Amino acid sequence: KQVSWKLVTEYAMETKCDDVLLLLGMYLEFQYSFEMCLKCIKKEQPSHYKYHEKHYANAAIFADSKNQKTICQQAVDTVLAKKRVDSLQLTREQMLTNRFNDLLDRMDIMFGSTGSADIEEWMAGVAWLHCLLPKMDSVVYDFLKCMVYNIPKKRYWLFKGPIDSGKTTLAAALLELCGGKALNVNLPLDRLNFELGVAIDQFLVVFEDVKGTGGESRDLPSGQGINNLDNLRDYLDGSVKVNLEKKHLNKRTQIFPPGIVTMNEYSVPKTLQARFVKQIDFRPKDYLKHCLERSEFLLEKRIIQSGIALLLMLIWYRPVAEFAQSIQSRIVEWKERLDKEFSLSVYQKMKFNVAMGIGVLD
Amino acid sequence: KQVSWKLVTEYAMETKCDDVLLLLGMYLEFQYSFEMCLKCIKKEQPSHYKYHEKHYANAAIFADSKNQKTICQQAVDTVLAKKRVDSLQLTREQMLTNRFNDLLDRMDIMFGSTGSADIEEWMAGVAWLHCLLPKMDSVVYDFLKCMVYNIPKKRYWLFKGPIDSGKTTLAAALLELCGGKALNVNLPLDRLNFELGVAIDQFLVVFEDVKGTGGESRDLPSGQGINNLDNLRDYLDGSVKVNLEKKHLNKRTQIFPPGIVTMNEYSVPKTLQARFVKQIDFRPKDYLKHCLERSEFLLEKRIIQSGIALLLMLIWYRPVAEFAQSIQSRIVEWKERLDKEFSLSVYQKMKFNVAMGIGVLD
Amino acid sequence: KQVSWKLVTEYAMETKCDDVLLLLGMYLEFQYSFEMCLKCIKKEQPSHYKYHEKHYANAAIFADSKNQKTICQQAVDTVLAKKRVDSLQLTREQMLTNRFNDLLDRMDIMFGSTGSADIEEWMAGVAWLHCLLPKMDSVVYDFLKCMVYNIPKKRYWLFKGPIDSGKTTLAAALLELCGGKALNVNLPLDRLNFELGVAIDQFLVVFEDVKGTGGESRDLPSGQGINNLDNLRDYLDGSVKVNLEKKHLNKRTQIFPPGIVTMNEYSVPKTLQARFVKQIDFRPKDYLKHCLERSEFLLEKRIIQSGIALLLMLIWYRPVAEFAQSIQSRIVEWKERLDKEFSLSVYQKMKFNVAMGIGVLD
Amino acid sequence: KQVSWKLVTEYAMETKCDDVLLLLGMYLEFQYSFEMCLKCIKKEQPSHYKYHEKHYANAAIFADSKNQKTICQQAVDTVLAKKRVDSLQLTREQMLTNRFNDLLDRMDIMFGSTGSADIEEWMAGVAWLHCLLPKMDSVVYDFLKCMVYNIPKKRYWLFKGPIDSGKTTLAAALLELCGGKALNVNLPLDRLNFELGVAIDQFLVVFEDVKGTGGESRDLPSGQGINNLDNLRDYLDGSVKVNLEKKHLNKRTQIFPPGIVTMNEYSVPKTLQARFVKQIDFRPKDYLKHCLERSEFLLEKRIIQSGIALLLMLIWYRPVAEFAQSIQSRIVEWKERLDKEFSLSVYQKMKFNVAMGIGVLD
Amino acid sequence: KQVSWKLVTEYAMETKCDDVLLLLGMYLEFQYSFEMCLKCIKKEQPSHYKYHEKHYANAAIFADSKNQKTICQQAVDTVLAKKRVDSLQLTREQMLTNRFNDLLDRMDIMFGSTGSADIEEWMAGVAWLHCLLPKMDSVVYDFLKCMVYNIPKKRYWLFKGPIDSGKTTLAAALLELCGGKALNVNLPLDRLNFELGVAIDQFLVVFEDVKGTGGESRDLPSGQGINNLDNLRDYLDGSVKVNLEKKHLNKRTQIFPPGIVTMNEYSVPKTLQARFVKQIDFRPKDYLKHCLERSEFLLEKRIIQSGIALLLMLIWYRPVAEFAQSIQSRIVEWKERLDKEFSLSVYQKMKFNVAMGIGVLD
DNA sequence: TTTTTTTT
Numbered sequence A, B, C, D, E: 001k002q003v004s005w006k007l008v009t010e011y012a013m014e015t016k017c018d019d020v021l022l023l024l025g026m027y028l029e030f031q032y033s034f035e036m037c038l039k040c041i042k043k044e045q046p047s048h049y050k051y052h053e054k055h056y057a058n059a060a061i062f063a064d065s066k067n068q069k070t071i072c073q074q075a076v077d078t079v080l081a082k083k084r085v086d087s088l089q090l091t092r093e094q095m096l097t098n099r100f101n102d103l104l105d106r107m108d109i110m111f112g113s114t115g116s117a118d119i120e121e122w123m124a125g126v127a128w129l130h131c132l133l134p135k136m137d138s139v140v141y142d143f144l145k146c147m148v149y150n151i152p153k154k155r156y157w158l159f160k161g162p163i164d165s166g167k168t169t170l171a172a173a174l175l176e177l178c179g180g181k182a183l184n185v186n187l188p189l190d191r192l193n194f195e196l197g198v199a200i201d202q203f204l205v206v207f208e209d210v211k212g213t214g215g216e217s218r219d220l221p222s223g224q225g226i227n228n229l230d231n232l233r234d235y236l237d238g239s240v241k242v243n244l245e246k247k248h249l250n251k252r253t254q255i256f257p258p259g260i261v262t263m264n265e266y267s268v269p270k271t272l273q274a275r276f277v278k279q280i281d282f283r284p285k286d287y288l289k290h291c292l293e294r295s296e297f298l299l300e301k302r303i304i305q306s307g308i309a310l311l312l313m314l315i316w317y318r319p320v321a322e323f324a325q326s327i328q329s330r331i332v333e334w335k336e337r338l339d340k341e342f343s344l345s346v347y348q349k350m351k352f353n354v355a356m357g358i359g360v361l362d
Numbered sequence F: 001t002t003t004t005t006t007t008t
């Protein structure tokens, strides 16, 4: 009779679809008789088999239309507008909710019908990291609180240690868990400005290890970067909004994000020391390294670097109540998986090997 | 009466033609008398001679239209939309089985009654290839599966070595096999982005003989590509979907494809070396030179460059079971045809001549 | 009564016009009475006087149309589509065969009943070219085969020799013969993209007198041409499809054409030297200066730099069977014409005149 | 009742207007009654007063139109299309003959009952110009021939010698005599892409005041025009079609025009020197200066800069036969008008005063 | 029951608006009843209250239109078209005469019965300006003739004198009297390209604050202004057209307008000095300082900045025959008003009183 | 929108 633009836009919202070509492509598939549709029969894609029957009648009429792309364009605008309306009104925790939500929806892929890897050696990495320092389970949820609360000045941690402390590898896992971006400070002041603009609207950041003048006595490479840092004062504080330099575009100005920093054992000014919520402190504990010499697969699957290992760790150790109300109901079912799939004695044996420097699976 | 955009699009889908000009041009040929059509009579191009009889009536009406380019637009979009929907809803495995079917379809024609090239000339290429490196098929199979798995970080291989070592030649055959793209990166960075646009929805990518810098005392002019690459490391990871770009079009959020790289032997930043799965060396060889002066027709016909040679090679060397179940029937059918065609004496006589470097066929 | 867009499209196709403003301007001329048409009466241009009477009735309606630019766009798009269809489906021999037939049509006009050009002045041009190099005739035939075969990494000829050696001139004649374009690579990288865009869907490219560096020892002003070109090793090799641009147009993927590089005598890095297949020397010969200074009709009519003189050279010298099967008869016909209009002794005299450095005619 | 677009296209053709705004703005004036049109009754502007009463009724309906800019767009397109057609089909001789015709209309108007000029003032300018160089009128004739002939590589004239020697004054007169525009090439190289875009479809070019190096020995201020020119080597040669670019436009491929280069006594490289036919060294001659001091009216009215001055010179000195055959009728009539007014005594009076350094106008 | 596009265009022409958004917003205000319109009632802006009552009805229909921006575009086109026609067809004297009428109109408001401004304070303005230089009112008349005649070479004036000696004040008032724009030359040459784009279609330019190289000779600050200038000898002398450019616009060509250069006591080459018609020396005179320090309404109301004050100065001092016949009537009416409102003794007293450095108006 | 601009 004629195409209902209404029904096309419903599907776009329903499927959260926001590519005009994908929307066109998928909606076109409904034009055959769902009554016999082989995808419906095999229930291969929910984005098809949940919808075909309702949309079929409209899809037959859509297939004949000479306006097809324009119908899909309006539909996608509705979905982009919905994101933009919502984006204006997120709490910081709601961001974190979604960041994690999507990682949970990735973790399916690791083990399920895709089955890309093994939840076992994943948990072996979880065991391997937990031993490095106290109570890592709590430490994550503590850092997490800080990044939602975003309390002025009370917003930053310093990972000080030697070189080869592991802090970079941890930093990878943290940023991998939480999002954000990494950034430099070891530049001529001249050049630096645009690098600072890279932060624009990241939730979180990490700063790369900064070349402390005179450090080469410590045999730590030494120079401009720390001189730059303390001149960046108010960016840390988050007291007031601040201008940001995009290349090839004009200024934007906003509250600078909270985040993380990395440090060899260089000199630190009192002023610079004063900024932090804490130092957290890292060193060689080489039986762990010899456990790695016996656990090499964790580097190969790269699980040791994994913020997903952190996600798994919280999913284990912490109270279900400790998660945000709704997504609690997801942590339940991963625990239901994990905790029957893995006893304490299993996790124990693993941690014992690591603590003994023995290969974690030995 | 009135153009059926339906029948236009149906031709576009069935040819997989995906350019408005190429579609526009070819469809216009159909406006003339099929009963007299010299192309149909001489069965010159199947993309014509099959379809003309069916499309003729509509093509005459199309030849009158004032809308012509707009009709071709909606047709071509249906082709891309189908591609992109498959680019999500297929496994990479099923993608290759689809790709292999299409190449097998070409082979069936090329050595059919049309038969327009000698099987033994084409096979002589396979000898040259499995002669270039040992275990050639086996490394080829290893590369293929690495590209099916596409597992993050372990997504890139390097070819490194001097001029005329053959590395370019091999990449061409793999790329003709796998259906990827080459990309050029010896270029200004803030102008490069649309090069990555080309990678949208592709299976695989190749980077060709990038300008490094330093060691140019060896007469190797320096350039920026290595800096560009390690700056662009964020793509190589396969970490998370990135929003790729194309002019006057909506951006395309996707995982960046895996790929392979070729290099005359500049320095690498060890960080840039840190990205790879593997290196392979390549070595100019006089005997593999001298043979071509006689066997010139191989290179004239680009045989040793072309992925059809690889497919014939894998059909030769590999177990039927190594191919996916879906295609294994055709693998049997084609093994039988190679088994019919050749004695090992023929094959080994040639491979002997190839080792001599003269008189490959004798 | 309405415009026939079909008549416009046919006109554009038949004249191979592919510029919307040329088409627009040309078609408007036909709005006047063809009987009174002084251009027809004079027979100024064939693209007019063959057509005016036939298109007159439609041009009178076109002159009133409100749509004009849109109609012309469609007609031009049809011509463009034909080129793309041809480019993908014809063998390179057919492309050259078609290009040869066209030049032979011009020669049917230039030396037609009008006698509009002097066949003796044109033939005189051939002799001066023939003395430009050793075995000139062979050198042309070799070059055509090379371009038609389009063999990987055997695709480029280097013309090298002093200022005013003749190399630019020989390139220019070959370029017209095959059809293709010149490109100025000395410009800076940021605009080279659209420079290379020129080459899309062309038979040859010519790179002109690229600047090297350090030859200012010899006062050869340095420039980036050589450095620029060594970014583009990939393009010369013809081994993989490259991505080409136009403004407000998405990239086109295809193989980069073969061609010629002219060269005042800067140095060459082996990466680039490896990619040429043949270097040809050129030298000042004062007696050619003395001849040209007394034979200046050669330059005024651009005879020696034009392509048609090379075709006449081929006709004078090659066995007919060396021409592609279809044109062989037209070659027989022109051979007879030339053999009739000139003796061999006349040609010997013309060569001798040039050898003496006297004006070509006595 | 509706707009005649044909009447607008006539006006655009008639005025040869090719700015949509200028066309629009003028056409809008015709909506008031010619009967009262004070511009008509002042009879000040030809492109108004000739036409108002014809277009009147259509201008009133155009005033009410909702489409106005589209109508003008089609009209300007037609005038533009006319130029492109002509730029292929005309000989350079017909072009020059046309350019003369238009200047001759302005000469008829200027010295008409407009009263608007004193031919005695303009003729004094001819005496000044003819005094500046030996054999001045033969120099103009030789230059005009050179531009009509456009012999490859033999295309450019180089003007040298001190500042304030009138070289740019002379260049302006030739540039107004022909069609063409000037360019400034001492620019940043990357901007130069759009600078050369100005040359598109024109007859002459003048490169204005190229700066070299070494001349700063005299403190000729140093610059890079010389080195920039030497990159445009193929543009000077005019041997093959170069690629030319405007903002937001795809390149048009075209033979770059012939022209003039003006400079002080910097050096020129071999390669660039080789590309000039003729070198004119102007010299300071203070009797000319003291004449001009007492001859202020020349520069006040821009006489000695102006191509109209040269044209009066040619009509004086050159035989009637030297003009293209069509205009010889008008030329004879203007020769009569000159001699009817100026006795040779008057011209000898003038040249005598100039030679004396006396104010010319006895 | 339709929008009259004509009434909207008449309003745009009437107000001389040429920004579509400024045009749009203002017209929509008329849709409310003018009869209670507070903007009418308060008599805020003439551009509103003159027209609200007239366009009310058409604005009421306009407010419902779905076409609104499309209407405004055609309206703005009309105003730009008027400027474009005027930009070619008027004498420089006629341009200035139009400019003067606008200032005279604005004076009728400022000093009206609605008069926002004290004509007595503005007369104090004229006193302080008349004190600033020798021979002031004859100096202005001579500057104006110079800009109107625009005689080549002899086009430019140089202001110099100490810091805080009035030079930019006078320049800004002259710039406002004529219209024009200021320019900054003290740059690296790359940006200088778009700087000059400002000058397109201006009647005047001012080169402010030209730094001399090595001005610390005087102990002035150094800068490249002078060395940047003297490249541009064509631009000042204005005998010939120059290419001019704005961001995102194709180049245009015109004579560069006449203007002023200002500086402190830097060096001037004779190469620069010969560019100038007159050099005006300013001096700090302390009674003016103490007068401003007792007459600050001058500064605070910006009186001595404003072109109106130079217009008033001309009206009071100059003979009527020095204006154009077009405006001589208005000049008489204003002269009558001022000669009624002020005695010669009273204004003579102000000049005497400013000579005392006491505040103007006691 | 791209392009041009920004950027070097």
Ligand SMILES: Nc1ncnc2c1ncn2[C@@H]1O[C@H](COP(=O)(O)OP(=O)(O)OP(=O)(O)O)[C@@H](O)[C@H]1O
Binding pocket: B132, B161, B162, B163, B164, B165, B166, B167, B168, B169, B170, B209, B262, B263, B264, B282, B283, B284, B285, B286, B288, B289, B292, C152, C153, C237, C239, C274
């Ligand atoms: N191993 C080899 N031994 C000898 N000749 C070779 C070998 N491989 C390639 N060739 C010759 O070198 C030509 C170019 O090969 P190819 O482009 O693959 O080499 P490459 O090492 O990638 O070169 P480049 O670094 O210059 O691009 C081939 O066409 C063939 O003629």
Ligand SMILES: Nc1ncnc2c1ncn2[C@@H]1O[C@H](COP(=O)(O)OP(=O)(O)OP(=O)(O)O)[C@@H](O)[C@H]1O
Binding pocket: C132, C161, C162, C163, C164, C165, C166, C167, C168, C169, C170, C209, C262, C263, C264, C282, C283, C284, C285, C286, C288, C289, C292, D152, D153
């Ligand atoms: N072999 C020759 N001997 C003498 N004069 C020559 C010779 N070849 C060309 N000429 C003259 O040199 C002019 C320029 O020729 P051409 O442009 O082909 O030379 P080129 O070596 O390519 O120069 P360039 O590098 O400067 O462009 C010709 O027009 C002719 O006048």
Ligand SMILES: Nc1ncnc2c1ncn2[C@@H]1O[C@H](COP(=O)(O)OP(=O)(O)OP(=O)(O)O)[C@@H](O)[C@H]1O
Binding pocket: D132, D162, D163, D164, D165, D166, D167, D168, D169, D170, D209, D262, D282, D283, D284, D285, D286, D288, D289, D292, E233, E234
């Ligand atoms: N031969 C001459 N001898 C003396 N004065 C001259 C001579 N020719 C020109 N003049 C004076 O030189 C003035 C400047 O002329 P013009 O701008 O054309 O000089 P130019 O030397 O060609 O300049 P540029 O090098 O800046 O292009 C003229 O207006 C005239 O007053």
Ligand SMILES: Nc1ncnc2c1ncn2[C@@H]1O[C@H](COP(=O)(O)OP(=O)(O)OP(=O)(O)O)[C@@H](O)[C@H]1O
Binding pocket: E132, E161, E162, E163, E164, E165, E166, E167, E168, E169, E170, E209, E283, E284, E285, E286, E288, E289, E292
């Ligand atoms: N002749 C003068 N005598 C005394 N004070 C003066 C005089 N002219 C200007 N002033 C004072 O100088 C201040 C600044 O004037 P103005 O901006 O025109 O100076 P300038 O020297 O032209 O500046 P600049 O060169 O920095 O642009 C005025 O506001 C006024 O206080």
Ligand SMILES: Nc1ncnc2c1ncn2[C@@H]1O[C@H](COP(=O)(O)OP(=O)(O)O)[C@@H](O)[C@H]1O
Binding pocket: A161, A162, A163, A164, A165, A166, A167, A168, A169, A170, A283, A284, A285, A286, A287, A288, A289
């Ligand atoms: N417990 C440990 N014992 C010994 N070495 C360690 C330990 N943890 C980390 N390292 C060393 O740190 C090296 C680099 O890890 P990284 O995350 O980069 O630390 P950093 O950022 O401090 O350099 C590792 O290769 C490892 O040898």
